[PDB]
Design an enzyme around this catalytic site. Sequence first.
Site, PDB file in Angstrom:
ATOM      1  N   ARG A 158       3.623   4.468   6.883  1.00  0.00           N
ATOM      2  CA  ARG A 158       2.601   5.231   6.180  1.00  0.00           C
ATOM      3  C   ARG A 158       3.245   6.048   5.065  1.00  0.00           C
ATOM      4  O   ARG A 158       4.402   6.453   5.171  1.00  0.00           O
ATOM      5  CB  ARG A 158       1.882   6.168   7.155  1.00  0.00           C
ATOM      6  CG  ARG A 158       1.242   5.459   8.338  1.00  0.00           C
ATOM      7  CD  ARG A 158       0.053   4.613   7.904  1.00  0.00           C
ATOM      8  NE  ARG A 158      -0.490   3.823   9.006  1.00  0.00           N
ATOM      9  CZ  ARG A 158      -1.057   4.337  10.092  1.00  0.00           C
ATOM     10  NH1 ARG A 158      -1.161   5.652  10.233  1.00  0.00           N
ATOM     11  NH2 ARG A 158      -1.522   3.536  11.042  1.00  0.00           N
ATOM     12  N   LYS A 202       0.392  10.883  12.309  1.00  0.00           N
ATOM     13  CA  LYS A 202      -1.013  10.570  12.539  1.00  0.00           C
ATOM     14  C   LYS A 202      -1.302  10.285  14.010  1.00  0.00           C
ATOM     15  O   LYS A 202      -2.084  10.994  14.646  1.00  0.00           O
ATOM     16  CB  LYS A 202      -1.433   9.368  11.689  1.00  0.00           C
ATOM     17  CG  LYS A 202      -2.900   8.997  11.829  1.00  0.00           C
ATOM     18  CD  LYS A 202      -3.272   7.852  10.901  1.00  0.00           C
ATOM     19  CE  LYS A 202      -4.756   7.534  10.988  1.00  0.00           C
ATOM     20  NZ  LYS A 202      -5.155   6.476  10.020  1.00  0.00           N
ATOM     21  N   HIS A 240      -1.302   2.718  -0.123  1.00  0.00           N
ATOM     22  CA  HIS A 240      -1.438   2.456   1.305  1.00  0.00           C
ATOM     23  C   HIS A 240      -1.646   0.963   1.524  1.00  0.00           C
ATOM     24  O   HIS A 240      -1.375   0.437   2.604  1.00  0.00           O
ATOM     25  CB  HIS A 240      -2.631   3.232   1.870  1.00  0.00           C
ATOM     26  CG  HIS A 240      -2.796   3.092   3.353  1.00  0.00           C
ATOM     27  ND1 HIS A 240      -1.836   3.502   4.251  1.00  0.00           N
ATOM     28  CD2 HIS A 240      -3.812   2.587   4.092  1.00  0.00           C
ATOM     29  CE1 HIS A 240      -2.251   3.256   5.481  1.00  0.00           C
ATOM     30  NE2 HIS A 240      -3.447   2.701   5.412  1.00  0.00           N
ATOM     31  N   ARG A 256       1.165  -1.182   2.750  1.00  0.00           N
ATOM     32  CA  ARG A 256       1.368  -1.294   4.188  1.00  0.00           C
ATOM     33  C   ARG A 256       0.680  -2.559   4.688  1.00  0.00           C
ATOM     34  O   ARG A 256       1.162  -3.223   5.606  1.00  0.00           O
ATOM     35  CB  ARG A 256       0.778  -0.070   4.891  1.00  0.00           C
ATOM     36  CG  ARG A 256       0.640  -0.204   6.400  1.00  0.00           C
ATOM     37  CD  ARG A 256      -0.100   0.993   6.974  1.00  0.00           C
ATOM     38  NE  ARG A 256      -0.520   0.786   8.357  1.00  0.00           N
ATOM     39  CZ  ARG A 256       0.311   0.658   9.385  1.00  0.00           C
ATOM     40  NH1 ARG A 256       1.623   0.717   9.195  1.00  0.00           N
ATOM     41  NH2 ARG A 256      -0.170   0.476  10.607  1.00  0.00           N
ATOM     42  N   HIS A 299       1.303   0.263  15.440  1.00  0.00           N
ATOM     43  CA  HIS A 299      -0.062   0.038  15.902  1.00  0.00           C
ATOM     44  C   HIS A 299      -0.071  -0.796  17.179  1.00  0.00           C
ATOM     45  O   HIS A 299       0.758  -1.688  17.357  1.00  0.00           O
ATOM     46  CB  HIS A 299      -0.866  -0.677  14.812  1.00  0.00           C
ATOM     47  CG  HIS A 299      -2.249  -1.064  15.233  1.00  0.00           C
ATOM     48  ND1 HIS A 299      -3.188  -0.142  15.645  1.00  0.00           N
ATOM     49  CD2 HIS A 299      -2.852  -2.273  15.308  1.00  0.00           C
ATOM     50  CE1 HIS A 299      -4.308  -0.767  15.955  1.00  0.00           C
ATOM     51  NE2 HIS A 299      -4.132  -2.061  15.760  1.00  0.00           N
ATOM     52  N   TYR A 316      -6.884  -6.437   9.760  1.00  0.00           N
ATOM     53  CA  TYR A 316      -5.879  -5.985   8.806  1.00  0.00           C
ATOM     54  C   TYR A 316      -5.167  -7.213   8.250  1.00  0.00           C
ATOM     55  O   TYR A 316      -4.223  -7.101   7.469  1.00  0.00           O
ATOM     56  CB  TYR A 316      -4.875  -5.062   9.502  1.00  0.00           C
ATOM     57  CG  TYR A 316      -4.190  -4.082   8.576  1.00  0.00           C
ATOM     58  CD1 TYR A 316      -4.932  -3.181   7.815  1.00  0.00           C
ATOM     59  CD2 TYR A 316      -2.800  -4.043   8.474  1.00  0.00           C
ATOM     60  CE1 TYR A 316      -4.309  -2.262   6.974  1.00  0.00           C
ATOM     61  CE2 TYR A 316      -2.166  -3.126   7.636  1.00  0.00           C
ATOM     62  CZ  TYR A 316      -2.928  -2.240   6.890  1.00  0.00           C
ATOM     63  OH  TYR A 316      -2.307  -1.332   6.062  1.00  0.00           O
TER      64      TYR A 316
END
EC number: 2.7.7.-
Lengths: 178, 356, 54, 55, 94
Positions: free
Chosen positions: B212, B235, B308, B311, B333, B342
């Site tokens: 991130r 996060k 972002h 990523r 994740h 994603y």
Amino acid sequence: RGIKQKTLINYMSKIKAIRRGLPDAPLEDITTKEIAAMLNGYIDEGKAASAKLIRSTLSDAFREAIAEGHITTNHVAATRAAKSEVRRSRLTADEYLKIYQAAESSPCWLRLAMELAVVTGQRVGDLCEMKWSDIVDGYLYVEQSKTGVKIAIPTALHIDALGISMKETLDKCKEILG
Amino acid sequence: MGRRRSHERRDLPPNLYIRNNGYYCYRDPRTGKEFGLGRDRRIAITEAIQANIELFSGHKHKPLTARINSDNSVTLHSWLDRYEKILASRGIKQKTLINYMSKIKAIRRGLPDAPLEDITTKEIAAMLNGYIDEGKAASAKLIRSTLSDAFREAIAEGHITTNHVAATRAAKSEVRRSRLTADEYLKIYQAAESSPCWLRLAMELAVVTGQRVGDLCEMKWSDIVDGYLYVEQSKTGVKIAIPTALHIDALGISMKETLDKCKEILGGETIIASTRREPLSSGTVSRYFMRARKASGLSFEGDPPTFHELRSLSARLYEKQISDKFAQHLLGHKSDTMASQYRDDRGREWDKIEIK
Amino acid sequence: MYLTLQEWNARQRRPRSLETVRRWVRESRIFPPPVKDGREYLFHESAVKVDLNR
Amino acid sequence: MYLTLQEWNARQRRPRSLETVRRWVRESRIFPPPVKDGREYLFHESAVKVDLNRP
Amino acid sequence: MTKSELIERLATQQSHIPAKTVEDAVKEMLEHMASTLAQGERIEIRGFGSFSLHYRAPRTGRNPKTGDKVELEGKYVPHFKPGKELRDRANIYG
DNA sequence: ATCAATATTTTGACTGATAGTGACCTGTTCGTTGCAACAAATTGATAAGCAATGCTTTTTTAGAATTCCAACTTATTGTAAAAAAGCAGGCTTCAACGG
């Protein structure tokens, strides 16, 4: 709401059913009993699937009715949707061969539509909207209408169980149909 | 009282009066004093009329087609003030609490000052849909959710008995944030020459680590031990160790090779520092990445990608490069729901199928 | 949604003469004021009467 | 996005005449004021007539 | 005390007046005094002084670096005459 | 089933704030007006600025980078009943050491 055309029509057919299914009186007067009396009436007739949509649609109407300040409660959220099991049998390899040969009396585009629908595995809806311009350098650009997914099936596939070739099938449509 | 009515208040609202100097002053129902506001007539009255949004002072209310059910209670604008005193005790990070306040502030300038059992579901929908017609659909969803939890805590304190907000639906966003391909990647990195040097290094470092942008500006040269890159996400809180042997052939970028470049050119306590040898913010990094985007000249469909998005591009590349399970542990994740949401394209690139 | 002076008077508890409608605006007896746009007031969709007295 | 003289007036609360709208432009009754481009005027998206008078 | 240091001190004293306001105020006053003397009019501030304009007859100038005679036109020159209050307060030697 | 007493049913007194105009006080602005300050006018010995113009040093200058301020647009993550242990604040007694 901004949805598909055919989709909006499906809901309308459900609303019309509710019209001739329930009297014309204030929403605050409609009881949960009358709602289940009409619902179960369609479940016994054999149409259990229809009861689910009609119950899920009628409920949305009231939920949007409360939003306007018409009533205070949704007497449809107290009921229970009837669980329906799919009874549409599947198709095997032996069965398909028996149908393709029986399609002789039928025109010369059905056989092509059969092999194509099995070699591409696409839905009947898009198979009719396929143009020869979609084929680009050994590919087959298909734009699914239902979901909207975009894929490209190469003209090299071939089913090894029925004896059908993607290429031989496409060219067979350019000669016969045209 | 001494003066009930007059030939001066005869053209003035209940609050606000007029002195012997032709000036006007609005009273205060909290002390009995007043401040001078206005020299004109249609101005002092047109000013002492919106505070006058609350004559409860006589008048009642009723729309077209509706019912009745009320008695007596208190204000509500104040409840929005007591609700904030409860959220500050729920133990929340210093960033999420601000996200709630901004929403509560929107509720302030959205709904009229009103008791709590007065604001009907119809009134909440008029304000909610107002943001939808403006395009801001993702906002109406958060404003509704927040305004929904506010009444929930209200009912648990003997004030309300129902939750009218639960009656209305929430908008359904579609996420119109275009992705970034590998080709458009080099197009931006090439235009990042006019921008500082730390930009290009952090741009490749953000695609080789797939971390991130926030944690990317938190890594120091002390977090690297035995060839590993200990990174602690803020996060979620997940802890991972990235090997300094990674490499992206699709872009020709080596992990170790990129790291060393930040040790000579940049130099500092953090992997990615500024020209002044100091750590930067997470809002300045993605800021300059925009400049190179617009200066590029390339066009997209919808909303231009972001820093972002690097990523995401990092995950898609590592997929075909090594494996799928590899582009899952690196992104810090877990679960099995976002790993697929994603990898999609969202109307950009055709999902070509190969003989395999 | 904004309406005219004629369209507004049509959607009230009791439609009166246009003259009387213009009077209320001049006397500032409606929240919020119509605001003259050119040469014809434009009422707000929520602009209702208030009425004063002495 | 910039609307024309006709397009802008066709989105107001009450569509007026082309010559009328041209008058406001000269009386600065259009905030913000349109921009000259070619031969016609280009108004702003959030352009709305105002009253530059305090009676 | 420069043109900038003059605004800073005045802004420090006057707090009920925006610092930005004092900045442009000083610049406009100087420009006004420079334009007045340009038109031909003289300035006269009681207690401060006065800015007049003295005439200079045209003469064959010279170059104090090379020694070349250079032509010179009439031209006027700004002159300042200290005021009564200005001379007294400044003069620290009776 | 009807007496009998207390909380019940509308009006009146109580006490200082609520209500809205008006007087009080004087900053602040404008017209009348007085006066220190400024300007013309001398005469003559002595001090200070003056013409041009490139190079060097000092002061003002227009942005532009940087970072908190800000209204919006996304990205992830996700617990409660039900028991049954695990700690310390101070009054309470047995058990060991010293006379």
